[PDB]
Amino acid sequence: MRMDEFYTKVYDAVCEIPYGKVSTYGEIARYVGMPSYARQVGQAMKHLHPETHVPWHRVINSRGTISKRDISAGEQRQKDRLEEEGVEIYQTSLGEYKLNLPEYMWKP
Template sequence: MPRTDEAKAFFHAVYSAIQEVPHGKVTSYGHIARLIGTPQRPRQVGVCLKHLSSDTSQTFHNGNVPWQRVINSKGIISPRGYPSGAANQAQALRGEGVTVTTGNLGELMVDFAEYGWFPRQLPSEEAAGIAPLIDSDDEG
């Protein structure tokens, strides 16, 4: 099914924002949603990542969008609907030097205090002199 112009713009905004997450850092679906001006849509950020192409001929693909750097707001790597999904993400993060631990229930976790990336605005927008979309008090 073809995407609407609104959906295309949202996917583009999500993928572009995730490209700005630095190597060795992680952020949350909710923070990406806030950075692009749609704080009510963290689940849709996850949907965008679910549909990230592996086709390198596409503008955005899993080779140029660091999907592994986005986790849930509790610092837990979200299950991917298949057994190896979270483990693959953990492996990719470990490859960037991020420590991934295992919780009491077997969940894979990252310490936001050490590896979190939560700027008030995207570095590209700050460099362009664009005012932040989010208030620093919005973080949670």
């Protein structure tokens, strides 16, 4: 499986995530038939162009929190987007954006 195919399938899957719901890097990786490619799913989101209509903001980590980038802008950009879709985000003693996974998890 070429990587250009992987990116396309990941993007396909992410576009399926319904407005107001979220999924997981690991889930999308399993959904497209590549259980060990959680990190690569992360790459796929990163490599996206900013003007994309792919809802990358709907893909969080298995712990139900927003992953931290090298910078801090992307993280913040995801929270704002999610809140704009009605997702209730709450912060942490450690300053981690977190949500109720079972409540917002997209279950195919």
